[PDB]
Curated annotation (Swiss-Prot), chain A:
A protein binds at residues 41, 84-86, 89-90. Homodimer. Interacts with E2F1. Interacts with (acetylated) STAT3; promoting STAT3 recruitment to chromatin. Interacts with CTCF; promoting BRD2 recruitment to chromatin. Residues 3-109 form the Bromo domain. The first bromo domain specifically recognizes histone H4 acetylated at 'Lys-12' (H4K12ac). It also specifically binds histone H4 acetyl-methylated at 'Lys-5' and 'Lys-12' (H4K5acme and H4K12acme, respectively). The second bromo domain recognizes and binds histone H4 acetylated at 'Lys-5' and 'Lys-12' (H4K5ac and H4K12ac, respectively). It is found in: Nucleus; Chromosome. Changing residue 106 to E: Loss of homodimerization. This is Bromodomain-containing protein 2. Chromatin reader protein that specifically recognizes and binds histone H4 acetylated at 'Lys-5' and 'Lys-12' (H4K5ac and H4K12ac, respectively), thereby controlling gene expression and remodeling chromatin structures. Recruits transcription factors and coactivators to target gene sites, and activates RNA polymerase II machinery for transcriptional elongation. It comes from Homo sapiens (Human).
Curated annotation (Swiss-Prot), chain B:
Chromatin reader protein that specifically recognizes and binds histone H4 acetylated at 'Lys-5' and 'Lys-12' (H4K5ac and H4K12ac, respectively), thereby controlling gene expression and remodeling chromatin structures. Recruits transcription factors and coactivators to target gene sites, and activates RNA polymerase II machinery for transcriptional elongation. Changing residue 80 to A: Partial loss of homodimerization. Abolished binding to histone H4 acetylated at 'Lys-12' (H4K12ac). The lineage of its organism: Eukaryota, Metazoa, Chordata, Craniata, Vertebrata. Some specific inhibitors of BRD2 that prevent binding to acetylated histone are promising therapeutic molecules for the treatment of cancers or inflammatory diseases. ABBV-744, a small molecule, has been tested on tumors with success: ABBV-744 antiproliferative activity is mainly restricted to cell lines of acute myeloid leukaemia and prostate cancer and is able to displace BRD4 from chromatin. GSK046 (iBET-BD2), which specifically inhibits the second bromo domain, is a promising therapeutic small molecule for the treatment of inflammatory and autoimmune diseases. Changing residue 86 to A: Abolished binding to histone H4 acetylated at 'Lys-12' (H4K12ac). Signal peptide: none annotated. It comes from the Eukaryota. Belongs to the BET family. This is Bromodomain-containing protein 2. A protein binds at residues 38, 81-83, 86-87. Residues 1-106 form the Bromo domain. The first bromo domain specifically recognizes histone H4 acetylated at 'Lys-12' (H4K12ac). It also specifically binds histone H4 acetyl-methylated at 'Lys-5' and 'Lys-12' (H4K5acme and H4K12acme, respectively). The second bromo domain recognizes and binds histone H4 acetylated at 'Lys-5' and 'Lys-12' (H4K5ac and H4K12ac, respectively). Homodimer. Interacts with E2F1. Interacts with (acetylated) STAT3; promoting STAT3 recruitment to chromatin. Interacts with CTCF; promoting BRD2 recruitment to chromatin.
Length: 115, 109
């Protein structure tokens, strides 16, 4: 099903920890609530919702088999934001800022995955 | 030249450049050719694979994360500018997943 690996530990304790506490992270810590936000078209446009709270819970429950699977969920979270929102929305700039940190930290992840 | 930039050139760019969905991304967006008079009003930092490839060939980058940010900007511009239902968005998503899969095995500095 899933494993604990050196890389998944790094994504959890180093990458996710740094993104979670960021001042721009608050819109991303829980699923988009289309009802609360009054976005009745959100789920007609975005077919795979994702958020850091869901990723964090997956990391804690050993859901992922490999680091790449977790990285793809981070990517989906950011990509959903760019696809749905207007280019001028502040949330787009917040996602871009977080995504740059994600890439910087991923650049220093351990090279070979080990259980 | 670093270990990581060599990986980005020999593994990541090699895989992306020859991909069957790469052709819209191999040269800068030509807004005149494509009839997109608002492209440069929305997208303020254009980026494309031909530019990244030339920068790798020319030892332009000082750190691997700089190259990774250019890949990211190229994909993000596509998501921001295009309509969600445009095929180019699916093509970018496919290429970006390959990018992330390969970056998962990139060496450390
Ligand atoms: C991530 C994302 O895609 N979105 C999202 C998700 C959650 C929240 C949220 C959580 C708690 N309160 N509001 C807000 C937003 C964005 N709205 C927004 C963002 C920043 C400033 C002002 C606004 Cl209006 C819309 C968009 C659909
Ligand atoms: C990457 C990107 O953002 N775009 C882009 C860039 C270059 C090209 C291109 C190069 C040579 N010929 N066409 C086309 C496109 C997209 N168009 C498009 C893509 C696939 C199928 C049909 C169409 Cl209409 C629009 C969008 C603005």
């Amino acid at each position: 099903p899933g494993r604990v690996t050196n890389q998944l530990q790094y994504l959890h304790k180093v990458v996710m920890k740094a993104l979670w506490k960021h001042q721009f992270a608050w819109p991303f810590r829980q699923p988009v609530d289309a009802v609360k936000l009054g976005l009745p078209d959100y789920h007609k446009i975005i077919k795979q919702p994702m958020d850091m709270g869901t990723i964090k819970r997956r990391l804690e429950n050993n859901y992922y088999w490999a680091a790449s699977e977790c990285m793809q969920d981070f990517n989906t979270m950011f990509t959903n934001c760019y696809i749905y929102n207007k280019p001028t929305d502040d949330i787009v700039l917040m996602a871009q800022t977080l995504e740059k940190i994600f890439l910087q930290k991923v650049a220093s992840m351990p090279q070979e995955e080990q259980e």
